[model samples]
Target chain A: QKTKIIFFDIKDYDKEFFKKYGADYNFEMTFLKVRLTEETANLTKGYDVVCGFANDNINKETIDIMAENGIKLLAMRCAGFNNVSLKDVNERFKVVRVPAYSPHAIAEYTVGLILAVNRKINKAYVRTREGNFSINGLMGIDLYEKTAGIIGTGKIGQILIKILRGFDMKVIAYDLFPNQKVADELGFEYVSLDELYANSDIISLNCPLTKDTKYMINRRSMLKMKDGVILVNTGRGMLIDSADLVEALKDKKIGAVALDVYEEEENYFFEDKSTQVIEDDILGRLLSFYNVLITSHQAYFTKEAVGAITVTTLNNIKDFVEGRPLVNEVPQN
Target chain B: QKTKIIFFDIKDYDKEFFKKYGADYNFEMTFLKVRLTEETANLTKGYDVVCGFANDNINKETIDIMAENGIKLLAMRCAGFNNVSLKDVNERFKVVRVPAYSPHAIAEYTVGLILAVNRKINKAYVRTREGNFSINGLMGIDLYEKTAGIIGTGKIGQILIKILRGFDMKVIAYDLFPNQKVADELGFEYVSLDELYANSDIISLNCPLTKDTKYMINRRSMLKMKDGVILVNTGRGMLIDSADLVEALKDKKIGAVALDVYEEEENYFFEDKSTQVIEDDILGRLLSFYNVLITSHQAYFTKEAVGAITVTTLNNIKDFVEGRPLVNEVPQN
Candidate 1:
């Protein structure tokens, strides 16, 4: 049986991803996500399968209504599954997610921020433009022989570790459940949180956002971390409290921070506001740090990631309809 | 016999250099070359040596007066020995000079400018401070396997070779006389000027300024270079033709220009200009390229280089008092 799938965030590379996964069989796929929205539910009225993006809050209520209306599959076009609650629906709707995208893109961006800040490159360029060539306080040390802490050793973490290793940096990983195979290959072993904190010159957060992992890098964790420790986060926000981070930066406790995903980013990011004032006060405070680097959460928006998301998502839709074992399946416990 | 030394246009580093160089020597060293006016030749009546920095006009008249007054030494506190006329000083005084400094400092600074401009670190810092984070054209490139060209195999050029090799970049050199040992050690080949221009993504000039080398990267030489070639000059200003470079940048033939020395730098560099606008027209024209980077001549001012200069220069003075051969004797025709 041919499955009819409706992808809300089916962008340019998303189309290629769907085709890649759906190449074996015939299936009717439709696009509904327009990158942004005013009304989302009305667009999902009669679709048998519905895919959601970041802005559209796909909680249990939205999922239940769609399940009642006969939507068999609810696939998320992103890695994080936090936005959708499985507790409320139970077995009402089958859900799947594009769990991980390009780790290199985000990891590289994180490193880019660290390097840019350390080298005062931004300030030097402006001075150069105005014919001012002075170097009063712009000397930066090399990353070679510096300790870099990796808090998570997932796919992205592994890639970043390799890149950092190539720079001749000492790597310390902190993961509750470390993968033995990757660790064996890279010589990465699980270390205590305190060890990772106190020794690392650059600490990167690549852990998932869950109840246990939320606010892992709070005031106490900040205290544990080394003085002049550079913190990089491209993972979900709420991992570190913004107010605490701002305070840490103000007190010169934080040497630098590269925050690609901020806590209230959903309300501000992925949308162009040329004519509007982004009235978020915390965002205003967060932007004050000269060492703090924030992107619009567009790390996974690379051409490669979008293609994989579409292809993997379409396979999930097709497998459910064909009554075959799904490649990326979730049990309805 | 004890010699009284005079230093013209000597900064604090010069004083430290002479002090360290003359530590074990029984000599009265007086830094007065900068202090020596037309009417101040009487001060040199007691001194046996006079050391001068760059831009001091040491001519036949000054040489005759110094020789008549029993001054036997005229030392130079730099790599370049252009200020002193060899013809007039041959039989009059024993001249000495420091022929080389650290090349790595200037070479590293060149690469720093390249990365800074390509990454838009300059624009990002300014905009971030103002609460703006729009990335219009800040995308950068990786030089992991890019190509670089060096004009001379001098100390600075050799240092650049090591630094670029560390980044895993292919390097080609172009000079009248190529050192086979350098080529073998660094795995760099000396190519024709045409070939170097055509193949290299970046070209740097570290050669000395002279009649043959003046404006070497002229309109004709620029013709052989590839489009979007990055030009770097940490050498003297006359090595590159500013008009040709300006035209190349505007036409997109040259990607970026990082100048540590310009043809007209003496008038403005190393001075604060926040109070008054720089009255130099050529420098004002250079400020137009947002990609261009200019810095005051500070590459040789590192702690390592400064210490080296002090110790090495001091030893030369001590060597002179005991009738021993001078360590850094000026190469005369």
Candidate 2:
């Protein structure tokens, strides 16, 4: 009845939290520093489950190798599954994910970014450290009474809206399936994307990455946005066209940008390459801008969030082993 | 006849705002780069009024020197008068100030610092710039449901409390002259300084400096604070002893410190000294900590606040020239 789970792309925080939660599930865990890919899939030979994060390449080739090597299930420790090639992977391998963890964690981090970039917190910190105290260009406007656009109304988006509303901000939301009940209760209006972009002083992207949402914040949409508007993206990286954002920044169309995820962040994000020069020109250019504030895909990196993700991920694996209904399973489309 | 006014310690932004307001007052103004000390106080000769900021030396000798130079009024562009030796100046010289400006500017900035420091926005920015995406050490707690201690709940403190309360934080105010009715209406409790120091997770100083309140955040009081408590000062520089603050930072009695004013800021603030090495060891040491955030008394640097300060200072001078009641005047005790 015991299960052996091999966790790939394991972070130091993951090792600690997963270990603490693993005891309850009574599962034997072997964590890997490498990601779950075609090259590293062989490492799952003796494991019943292969656990990974959003960056892990859970494509058809990797899945085939994993299944042949005795891995019965592919477990995602994160909420997003765009990296998983669901349509290509057959029913031979069961795929499960930790659907929702702590929405408050990611939501608060988003709010943190909104405040930080607007107030030039990073610039001010560097100036102070170097004995420069002049605040000539560090003036930031107040958030109260300003209009904000929330591009998604999911759990995380909802949490963020509530917090922004607490600041007495006028919040507008856009979602394919709008929850009118919650919208009415929260006092935020539902608006079209065009209206949201035209009127909002600040816009936050919290939608999932699908065909409709991918590259939704491109050049056309950027042009529609008010001049000197603030943009915060804590959702999927591909939600924005990185090139378009850079152009807007250069032209001064964008006032400030706080990004938790980037379009091509898989190669550059989550690892310490600080001692070396950044190889990606697009990301490097983004970082060079004084108005842009970028953090690694760490919006969900709070203690409460990490603990919940680990516990939920472990529980998903347990459910498969105990022959419980695979409620969190993803199938081949 | 044209009124001649001398403005000391003039910065570019100050010059711009003062010029805009001076046009309305129709005064012949002379702006000076050097502060009004005993050595340079003679520059006020033939000038009707000598205007200065908080950092300018306005002691017995400086005021006497200005009076001898034919300056009838000493106009303060800012609110704090700790730099002015009011008791030493005779009734022959008049003193006036911009008593109140935009309280929202400083309060919003204080809230911004609280969020930035707690969330480690600056550290995250540096890490992400070099393509380091690890969030191992950057986990921040939720501001919701935390206790905040606000010392000196004057205009600025009340505004800050409102913002903090918006985040669902419980706020306690400690003021010698506690406005019980205002406290009741604002939904915050009034507590003794001892209780505030002991109970608050975050503490901000917004009180004016007096003999009894000088160095209030020194070693003795700082020791009573909770471990890893946040310290913020947007008030006068002399409120906290700089030497004692350095020791508290080293001992970890203070978790994070955000300063808009510094004890010897007159020597270094509002100037770009990044090209030169910091000469003062105490101030230099304070700049080295990752937990510290400093701005050159920029909490009142917002457009609204700056306009208010400049316009008020100009109007005060106009009032003095036209033989009106010195409503905003400071008397020699």
Candidate 3:
């Protein structure tokens, strides 16, 4: 008999990939447009595995309901597990995730954001479309020979550094556990956060979110940074203080910003809120800025990345069904 | 006596820069809002030199008017001499121009356009602004390890190749007069135009517009290119056949396009036409495509490039006034 799986918060893209890749696995997959919450947990009644996306509510209540519903495994299609309550599962159910789906997608998008903001490409596009061809305020500096400060030297950060280096940009990076080997190989220097902030014309956040790393780019850090510094965030949103960033942008201390993530993105990122007014004042203000480009958590939304995710997710389910050890299993802290 | 220079089509940016830099030359400059045409050529009366921009009509008629009005030299503030008939001057009035201002500006913008089109940054910006944050249909391929075909390995083309190589892309170029030294140093192979079109994922035009290169990226050349290949042009607009490109775009033969120059840009570019309808059907059709990003000749409109143009234009004028050999003079053909 085939394993039963129910996917929550499933979009057309998610459904298409899951259906295409899951055919070989012979799983009885049920796609649900609704998110997995306490109220929707009853829908997982006879499913052996429950698949949830990043924004799905997989908290204590949702987990308790899933446990009562006899869900043997909880599988996350994305890498982040912040939405999942691991302690609530506690031997009653195993949690597995597709970790490190596509670093290239995120890294390439980071460079895209850099180029977009640096060259004012977004502004120019808008102006031209409106038949306003005057490039009056669209003057930008050359990225070549400019210093770039990358926060985090992980897979995405390293890839970003390589691309920026291609532009002949001088790179300085900051990471808690600095890989000296990578620094040497990439021809970049590992620097203190303060040094990176002070020297870099552009700063990109690619670090993981942690207690120490959260709000790392706050008021104090902004003050340390050069005036009119370009900031890019493809990492977790909490890495920079939203309120502080807004202030810096208004003051022109932050030259420009390109954000793929926001601190309060869960309510807004993936949804089409065009007809509705954004209630988040901070988000509204950020959107109003000409220099600020906010892409809805889409750095990893590439064809290659999605394909990798689909394959990895199915393999993860296959491993669990075969009674093999869950290599991607999350531990309760 | 201070040299009298009447500059046509002068904007605030031009006036600001020319005034700032022309202070040393001590030239009596008169800024005009109109372009130098057959009718406007009479405005050059009592002026020792006539400075004009790219769109100015400096044909035989305009030259006759300028000569009758006692204009000693025709100083072009831009690189392209197509606007001025060199043969008509015929030792009557010497012509000098600011050739090769900032290749870095144009080269950097080429990369920006590539990223913008490849990553759909412009579309994403518009979507996010309207509060539509869905990443569906926004999936872009990773540029890393992809092959890029470059036409014309001149200064701007060479700089762009170096930048693309930094992304770890395999570059193939086509140049009439290939530099073997640059090919070896940059690690790019010089291939035939047909070979380049067949293999490249992205093709950028950076060569000079000449008899041999006119409409080089027409239907035949495009048909030889890889399906869904990205096309970028920061070079002369006439290098591409706009009508053929429009057809290709309709057929989905072209994946994406980012054009900084248009073939019929003289009637439309550098002015605000937002309130008016686009008279050209081809241009209107081109603007309708979501994948096409048309920036009005702004690749060289960076701060560095503008500053270079300012200094060079003033120096050209100074050199002519001082009776020094005109190093930047345009010879009559």
lDDT of 2 by residue, A69-180 (tens): 8778888888667788887667777888877657798899999999998888888887886678888778888999999999999999999999999999999999999999
Winning model by lDDT: 3
Off by over 4 Å in 1: A31-47, A55-72, A80-96, A120-139, A177-191, A208-213, A264-266, A272-280, A323-333, B1-333
Using TM-score as the measure, what is the rank order of every candidate, best first? 3, 2, 1
The parts of candidate 3 lying over 4 Å away from their true place are A8-16, A23-26, A30-46, A54-70, A80-95, A275-279, A324-333, B1-333
Interface RMSD, prediction 2: 12.4
lDDT accuracy of residue A305 in candidate 2: 82
* Candidate closest to the true structure, highest TM-score: 3
The digit string of per-residue lDDT tens for model 1 on B1-333 reads: 566776677677667766775677767777653544335545668777776656665666766777888887766666656556678766767888765577676777777766666566776776786678888756666777888888899878888888888889899998888898989999788998888988998888888888999999988888888886778888888888887776676666777678888887756665545322344434655654566778877667576676666566556666776789987888567
Residue-level lDDT of model 2, residues B1-333, one tens digit each, is 788889999999899998887777789998899988888888888888889987687888888888777788888988767788888777767999887557899899898888778888877877886678887667667879889999998989998998888999999999998998888878799999999999999999999989988999899999999988988998888899988887787677887888988988877886655433345556765665667778888888788887888888888988888899998898777
Instruction: Quote the TM-score that chain A achieves in each candidate.
Output: 0.75, 0.79, 0.82
- TM-score of each predicted structure versus truth: 0.44, 0.46, 0.48
Query: Cα deviation of A249 in candidate 3 (Å)?
Result: 1.8
Chain B alone, TM-score of each model?
A: 0.72, 0.76, 0.82
